[PDB]
mmCIF file of C-alpha atoms and ligand atoms in Angstrom:
data_model
loop_
_atom_site.group_PDB
_atom_site.id
_atom_site.type_symbol
_atom_site.label_atom_id
_atom_site.label_comp_id
_atom_site.label_asym_id
_atom_site.label_seq_id
_atom_site.Cartn_x
_atom_site.Cartn_y
_atom_site.Cartn_z
ATOM 1 C CA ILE A 1 106.761 105.921 97.680
ATOM 2 C CA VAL A 2 110.650 105.694 97.374
ATOM 3 C CA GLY A 3 112.410 106.070 94.011
ATOM 4 C CA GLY A 4 109.202 106.892 92.155
ATOM 5 C CA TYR A 5 108.234 109.922 90.007
ATOM 6 C CA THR A 6 105.717 112.784 90.236
ATOM 7 C CA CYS A 7 102.616 111.233 88.515
ATOM 8 C CA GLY A 8 101.220 114.480 87.279
ATOM 9 C CA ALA A 9 97.897 115.967 88.673
ATOM 10 C CA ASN A 10 95.019 113.573 88.062
ATOM 11 C CA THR A 11 96.910 110.806 86.089
ATOM 12 C CA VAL A 12 95.800 108.275 88.716
ATOM 13 C CA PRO A 13 92.070 109.140 88.836
ATOM 14 C CA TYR A 14 91.023 106.166 91.129
ATOM 15 C CA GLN A 15 93.573 107.286 93.856
ATOM 16 C CA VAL A 16 91.883 108.545 97.093
ATOM 17 C CA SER A 17 93.315 110.017 100.199
ATOM 18 C CA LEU A 18 91.831 109.118 103.660
ATOM 19 C CA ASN A 19 91.755 112.080 106.061
ATOM 20 C CA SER A 20 91.052 112.396 109.681
ATOM 21 C CA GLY A 21 92.268 115.972 110.172
ATOM 22 C CA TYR A 22 95.350 115.016 107.984
ATOM 23 C CA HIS A 23 96.214 112.400 105.344
ATOM 24 C CA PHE A 24 96.724 108.849 106.879
ATOM 25 C CA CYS A 25 96.199 106.241 104.077
ATOM 26 C CA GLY A 26 95.320 105.816 100.380
ATOM 27 C CA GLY A 27 92.406 104.037 98.852
ATOM 28 C CA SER A 28 91.011 103.175 95.486
ATOM 29 C CA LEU A 29 87.505 104.226 94.082
ATOM 30 C CA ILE A 30 85.667 101.053 92.740
ATOM 31 C CA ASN A 31 82.371 102.792 91.980
ATOM 32 C CA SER A 32 80.493 106.070 92.739
ATOM 33 C CA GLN A 33 79.862 105.060 96.378
ATOM 34 C CA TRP A 34 82.587 102.662 97.403
ATOM 35 C CA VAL A 35 86.286 102.764 98.262
ATOM 36 C CA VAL A 36 88.529 99.782 99.046
ATOM 37 C CA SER A 37 91.562 100.311 101.358
ATOM 38 C CA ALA A 38 93.530 98.309 103.937
ATOM 39 C CA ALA A 39 91.968 97.005 107.117
ATOM 40 C CA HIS A 40 94.923 98.290 109.058
ATOM 41 C CA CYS A 41 93.857 101.818 108.023
ATOM 42 C CA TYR A 42 90.634 101.549 109.933
ATOM 43 C CA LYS A 43 89.636 104.716 111.879
ATOM 44 C CA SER A 44 86.449 106.318 113.077
ATOM 45 C CA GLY A 45 85.692 109.611 111.361
ATOM 46 C CA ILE A 46 87.115 109.100 107.867
ATOM 47 C CA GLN A 47 86.673 111.770 105.108
ATOM 48 C CA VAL A 48 87.388 110.558 101.568
ATOM 49 C CA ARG A 49 89.385 113.052 99.386
ATOM 50 C CA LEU A 50 89.060 112.512 95.584
ATOM 51 C CA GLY A 51 90.731 114.130 92.525
ATOM 52 C CA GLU A 52 93.541 115.304 94.740
ATOM 53 C CA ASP A 53 97.056 116.190 93.452
ATOM 54 C CA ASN A 54 98.747 118.374 96.159
ATOM 55 C CA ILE A 55 97.095 117.140 99.385
ATOM 56 C CA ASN A 56 98.016 120.563 101.048
ATOM 57 C CA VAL A 57 96.563 122.886 98.435
ATOM 58 C CA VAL A 58 93.033 123.180 97.103
ATOM 59 C CA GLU A 59 93.488 123.258 93.380
ATOM 60 C CA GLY A 60 89.921 123.021 92.325
ATOM 61 C CA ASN A 61 89.193 119.459 91.151
ATOM 62 C CA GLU A 62 88.681 117.788 94.579
ATOM 63 C CA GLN A 63 85.623 116.206 96.070
ATOM 64 C CA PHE A 64 85.544 115.640 99.903
ATOM 65 C CA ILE A 65 83.029 113.324 101.133
ATOM 66 C CA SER A 66 82.485 111.756 104.490
ATOM 67 C CA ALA A 67 82.146 107.964 105.092
ATOM 68 C CA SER A 68 78.805 106.613 106.120
ATOM 69 C CA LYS A 69 79.893 103.064 106.851
ATOM 70 C CA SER A 70 83.240 100.994 107.181
ATOM 71 C CA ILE A 71 83.514 97.280 106.880
ATOM 72 C CA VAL A 72 86.776 95.467 107.803
ATOM 73 C CA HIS A 73 87.057 91.954 106.354
ATOM 74 C CA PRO A 74 85.563 89.387 108.779
ATOM 75 C CA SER A 75 88.781 87.410 108.998
ATOM 76 C CA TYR A 76 91.275 90.365 109.334
ATOM 77 C CA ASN A 77 93.988 89.519 111.807
ATOM 78 C CA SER A 78 95.784 92.543 112.975
ATOM 79 C CA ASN A 79 98.750 90.522 114.180
ATOM 80 C CA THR A 80 99.613 88.875 110.868
ATOM 81 C CA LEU A 81 97.922 91.324 108.523
ATOM 82 C CA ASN A 82 96.285 88.454 106.929
ATOM 83 C CA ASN A 83 93.127 89.667 104.959
ATOM 84 C CA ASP A 84 94.202 93.407 105.075
ATOM 85 C CA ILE A 85 91.245 94.965 103.156
ATOM 86 C CA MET A 86 88.290 97.106 104.132
ATOM 87 C CA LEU A 87 85.473 98.795 102.201
ATOM 88 C CA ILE A 88 84.300 102.342 102.802
ATOM 89 C CA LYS A 89 80.770 103.698 101.643
ATOM 90 C CA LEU A 90 80.683 107.438 100.822
ATOM 91 C CA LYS A 91 77.750 109.378 102.300
ATOM 92 C CA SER A 92 76.930 110.697 98.779
ATOM 93 C CA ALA A 93 77.957 109.551 95.292
ATOM 94 C CA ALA A 94 81.100 111.012 93.883
ATOM 95 C CA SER A 95 80.708 112.717 90.633
ATOM 96 C CA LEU A 96 82.996 110.800 88.080
ATOM 97 C CA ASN A 97 85.091 112.753 85.552
ATOM 98 C CA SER A 98 88.496 112.855 83.972
ATOM 99 C CA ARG A 99 90.234 113.228 87.371
ATOM 100 C CA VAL A 100 87.918 111.034 89.485
ATOM 101 C CA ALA A 101 87.262 107.529 88.003
ATOM 102 C CA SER A 102 86.805 104.044 89.319
ATOM 103 C CA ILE A 103 89.154 101.158 88.789
ATOM 104 C CA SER A 104 87.911 97.888 87.813
ATOM 105 C CA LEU A 105 88.074 94.606 89.886
ATOM 106 C CA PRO A 106 90.217 91.835 88.407
ATOM 107 C CA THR A 107 88.540 88.856 86.516
ATOM 108 C CA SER A 108 91.655 86.717 87.460
ATOM 109 C CA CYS A 109 94.817 86.956 89.415
ATOM 110 C CA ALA A 110 98.086 88.463 87.815
ATOM 111 C CA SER A 111 101.171 86.541 86.832
ATOM 112 C CA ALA A 112 104.605 87.112 88.577
ATOM 113 C CA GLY A 113 106.597 89.424 86.130
ATOM 114 C CA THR A 114 103.493 91.503 85.248
ATOM 115 C CA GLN A 115 104.332 95.189 85.595
ATOM 116 C CA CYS A 116 102.144 97.316 87.939
ATOM 117 C CA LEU A 117 101.648 100.865 88.994
ATOM 118 C CA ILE A 118 101.617 101.755 92.752
ATOM 119 C CA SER A 119 100.876 105.306 93.957
ATOM 120 C CA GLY A 120 100.528 107.183 97.054
ATOM 121 C CA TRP A 121 101.672 110.284 99.370
ATOM 122 C CA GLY A 122 103.698 108.237 101.723
ATOM 123 C CA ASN A 123 107.457 108.672 102.699
ATOM 124 C CA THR A 124 109.882 109.119 99.947
ATOM 125 C CA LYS A 125 113.031 108.209 101.939
ATOM 126 C CA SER A 126 114.535 104.745 102.372
ATOM 127 C CA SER A 127 115.953 105.635 105.896
ATOM 128 C CA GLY A 128 114.866 109.104 106.807
ATOM 129 C CA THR A 129 111.650 110.927 106.576
ATOM 130 C CA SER A 130 110.227 113.165 103.990
ATOM 131 C CA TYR A 131 106.550 113.342 103.061
ATOM 132 C CA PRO A 132 105.608 114.664 99.620
ATOM 133 C CA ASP A 133 102.684 117.017 98.909
ATOM 134 C CA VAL A 134 102.118 115.662 95.518
ATOM 135 C CA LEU A 135 101.206 112.041 94.254
ATOM 136 C CA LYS A 136 104.198 109.837 93.485
ATOM 137 C CA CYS A 137 104.024 106.975 91.143
ATOM 138 C CA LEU A 138 106.168 103.805 90.754
ATOM 139 C CA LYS A 139 106.221 101.087 88.124
ATOM 140 C CA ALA A 140 107.103 97.665 89.622
ATOM 141 C CA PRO A 141 106.575 93.972 88.760
ATOM 142 C CA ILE A 142 104.952 91.266 90.757
ATOM 143 C CA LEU A 143 107.762 89.034 92.219
ATOM 144 C CA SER A 144 107.543 85.249 92.255
ATOM 145 C CA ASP A 145 105.975 83.701 95.386
ATOM 146 C CA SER A 146 109.239 81.855 96.252
ATOM 147 C CA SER A 147 111.082 85.158 96.261
ATOM 148 C CA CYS A 148 108.366 86.726 98.593
ATOM 149 C CA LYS A 149 108.351 83.858 101.109
ATOM 150 C CA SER A 150 112.070 83.719 101.204
ATOM 151 C CA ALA A 151 112.214 87.373 102.134
ATOM 152 C CA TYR A 152 109.615 86.939 104.903
ATOM 153 C CA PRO A 153 109.755 83.311 106.258
ATOM 154 C CA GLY A 154 106.529 82.033 107.838
ATOM 155 C CA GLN A 155 104.723 85.439 107.208
ATOM 156 C CA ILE A 156 103.336 85.275 103.703
ATOM 157 C CA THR A 157 99.794 83.659 103.288
ATOM 158 C CA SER A 158 97.860 83.005 100.150
ATOM 159 C CA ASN A 159 96.176 86.368 100.441
ATOM 160 C CA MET A 160 99.448 88.290 99.892
ATOM 161 C CA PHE A 161 101.856 88.929 97.152
ATOM 162 C CA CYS A 162 105.141 90.831 96.889
ATOM 163 C CA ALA A 163 106.001 93.522 94.355
ATOM 164 C CA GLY A 164 109.123 95.573 93.637
ATOM 165 C CA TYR A 165 112.885 95.090 93.386
ATOM 166 C CA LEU A 166 114.924 92.735 95.399
ATOM 167 C CA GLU A 167 117.901 95.073 94.973
ATOM 168 C CA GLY A 168 116.041 97.869 96.874
ATOM 169 C CA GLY A 169 115.835 101.476 96.006
ATOM 170 C CA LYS A 170 112.266 101.456 94.772
ATOM 171 C CA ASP A 171 109.214 100.680 96.906
ATOM 172 C CA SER A 172 105.930 101.814 98.513
ATOM 173 C CA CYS A 173 106.313 103.066 102.274
ATOM 174 C CA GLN A 174 104.382 104.250 105.297
ATOM 175 C CA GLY A 175 101.806 106.736 104.136
ATOM 176 C CA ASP A 176 101.087 104.725 101.133
ATOM 177 C CA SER A 177 99.079 101.972 103.039
ATOM 178 C CA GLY A 178 95.659 101.167 101.470
ATOM 179 C CA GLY A 179 96.694 102.544 98.081
ATOM 180 C CA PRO A 180 96.268 100.898 94.830
ATOM 181 C CA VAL A 181 98.519 98.400 92.748
ATOM 182 C CA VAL A 182 97.078 98.379 89.329
ATOM 183 C CA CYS A 183 98.243 95.718 86.751
ATOM 184 C CA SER A 184 96.913 95.608 83.130
ATOM 185 C CA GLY A 185 94.108 98.044 84.096
ATOM 186 C CA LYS A 186 92.744 96.141 87.197
ATOM 187 C CA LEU A 187 93.153 96.596 90.879
ATOM 188 C CA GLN A 188 95.370 93.645 91.925
ATOM 189 C CA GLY A 189 96.707 95.021 95.250
ATOM 190 C CA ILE A 190 96.451 97.090 98.150
ATOM 191 C CA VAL A 191 99.586 98.539 99.876
ATOM 192 C CA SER A 192 99.769 96.464 103.167
ATOM 193 C CA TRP A 193 103.136 96.088 104.893
ATOM 194 C CA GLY A 194 106.964 95.536 104.511
ATOM 195 C CA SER A 195 110.262 95.754 106.458
ATOM 196 C CA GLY A 196 111.572 99.283 106.161
ATOM 197 C CA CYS A 197 111.092 100.697 102.728
ATOM 198 C CA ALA A 198 113.280 100.116 99.546
ATOM 199 C CA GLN A 199 115.773 97.974 101.582
ATOM 200 C CA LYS A 200 117.551 95.120 99.640
ATOM 201 C CA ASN A 201 115.843 91.764 99.810
ATOM 202 C CA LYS A 202 112.701 93.245 101.629
ATOM 203 C CA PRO A 203 110.132 93.994 98.891
ATOM 204 C CA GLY A 204 106.688 95.348 99.591
ATOM 205 C CA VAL A 205 103.832 93.005 100.704
ATOM 206 C CA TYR A 206 100.371 93.720 99.165
ATOM 207 C CA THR A 207 96.817 92.210 99.829
ATOM 208 C CA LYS A 208 95.862 90.105 96.859
ATOM 209 C CA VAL A 209 92.679 91.552 95.643
ATOM 210 C CA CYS A 210 91.841 88.762 93.204
ATOM 211 C CA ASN A 211 90.900 86.571 96.271
ATOM 212 C CA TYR A 212 88.310 88.984 97.523
ATOM 213 C CA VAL A 213 86.175 89.855 94.447
ATOM 214 C CA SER A 214 83.169 87.790 95.496
ATOM 215 C CA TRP A 215 83.235 89.189 99.045
ATOM 216 C CA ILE A 216 83.635 92.755 97.566
ATOM 217 C CA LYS A 217 80.596 92.348 95.302
ATOM 218 C CA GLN A 218 78.404 90.635 97.724
ATOM 219 C CA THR A 219 79.184 93.078 100.526
ATOM 220 C CA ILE A 220 78.571 96.219 98.308
ATOM 221 C CA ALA A 221 75.309 94.736 97.004
ATOM 222 C CA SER A 222 73.976 94.265 100.555
ATOM 223 C CA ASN A 223 75.008 97.598 102.137
HETATM 224 C C1 LIG B 301 103.828 88.637 112.499
HETATM 225 C C2 LIG B 301 103.426 89.016 111.149
HETATM 226 N N1 LIG B 301 102.738 88.069 110.313
HETATM 227 N N2 LIG B 301 103.772 90.175 110.663
HETATM 228 C C3 LIG B 301 104.420 91.242 111.523
HETATM 229 C C4 LIG B 301 103.688 92.534 111.614
HETATM 230 C C5 LIG B 301 103.107 92.907 110.248
HETATM 231 O O1 LIG B 301 103.911 93.881 109.720
HETATM 232 C C6 LIG B 301 103.513 95.226 110.137
HETATM 233 C C7 LIG B 301 102.609 95.219 111.019
HETATM 234 C C8 LIG B 301 102.198 96.441 111.566
HETATM 235 C C9 LIG B 301 102.841 97.685 111.266
HETATM 236 N N3 LIG B 301 102.695 98.887 111.655
HETATM 237 C C10 LIG B 301 103.375 99.679 111.010
HETATM 238 C C11 LIG B 301 103.588 100.979 111.220
HETATM 239 N N4 LIG B 301 104.410 98.916 110.049
HETATM 240 C C12 LIG B 301 105.572 99.308 109.286
HETATM 241 C C13 LIG B 301 105.082 99.442 107.908
HETATM 242 C C14 LIG B 301 103.664 99.718 107.646
HETATM 243 C C15 LIG B 301 103.280 99.751 106.264
HETATM 244 C C16 LIG B 301 104.175 99.539 105.243
HETATM 245 C C17 LIG B 301 103.799 99.711 103.929
HETATM 246 C C18 LIG B 301 104.708 99.556 102.874
HETATM 247 C C19 LIG B 301 106.130 99.189 103.164
HETATM 248 C C20 LIG B 301 106.943 99.063 102.219
HETATM 249 N N5 LIG B 301 108.262 98.934 102.535
HETATM 250 N N6 LIG B 301 106.585 99.083 100.963
HETATM 251 C C21 LIG B 301 106.545 99.217 104.615
HETATM 252 C C22 LIG B 301 105.522 99.405 105.592
HETATM 253 C C23 LIG B 301 105.961 99.383 106.890
HETATM 254 C C24 LIG B 301 103.880 97.573 110.297
HETATM 255 C C25 LIG B 301 104.199 96.393 109.694
HETATM 256 C C26 LIG B 301 102.653 91.952 109.317
HETATM 257 C C27 LIG B 301 103.393 90.768 109.328
HETATM 258 CA CA1 LIG B 302 100.219 120.286 91.933
HETATM 259 CA CA1 LIG B 303 94.526 119.525 96.739
#
């Protein structure tokens, strides 16, 4: 996250770190046994880390659980990143508390101009590299579809939306991938892609969760 702030330990209770010997992607807890993340974060041997603040310090509120199953969307296209969403089932149920909570799925899509909260442990530099140890947060509005498509001609599908600031300076970045975009208390996006981070006229691109609710609910119920 570039131009964001330190969230504060366990202020984003649904945020999860995906670890395979190190942090590689974020994710969201949707219930005691399932996490939603980006299909492009798929890896074999994932461990889910919950209630995390500093990813390099064990502060006592963490729950580390291995994944039993990973399901990438049936129509995920790695070339275009269309349908960039995957579900992860935990080996055992997480214990929910003040610092580990699930986020609700939306009952409808969000309007452009709606303010959202994006979070992660990704790079904090526009052009350079600096990875934080603590969770970073960022408030950003959903951009109009025309602004999104103008920034990335021929690359935006109906399963994507843009959020941020056209003037640059504030955005999600690499390391944030699979992380939550919460608007009006519902999970509306997953950190997917972009061009650089916080560059002018190149806002972040997110998977549009409101289009996958029925697939998420049907998949979870049969697995
Ligand atoms: C051809 C086509 N439809 N596309 C070109 C390729 C693809 O964009 C990609 C695809 C694969 C990538 N692999 C990597 C490492 N990047 C850079 C990458 C990855 C994730 C980001 C998340 C947020 C942001 C952000 N600026 N908020 C930038 C990112 C940049 C990537 C960016 C999706 C769109
Ligand atoms: Ca801390
Ligand atoms: Ca920790």
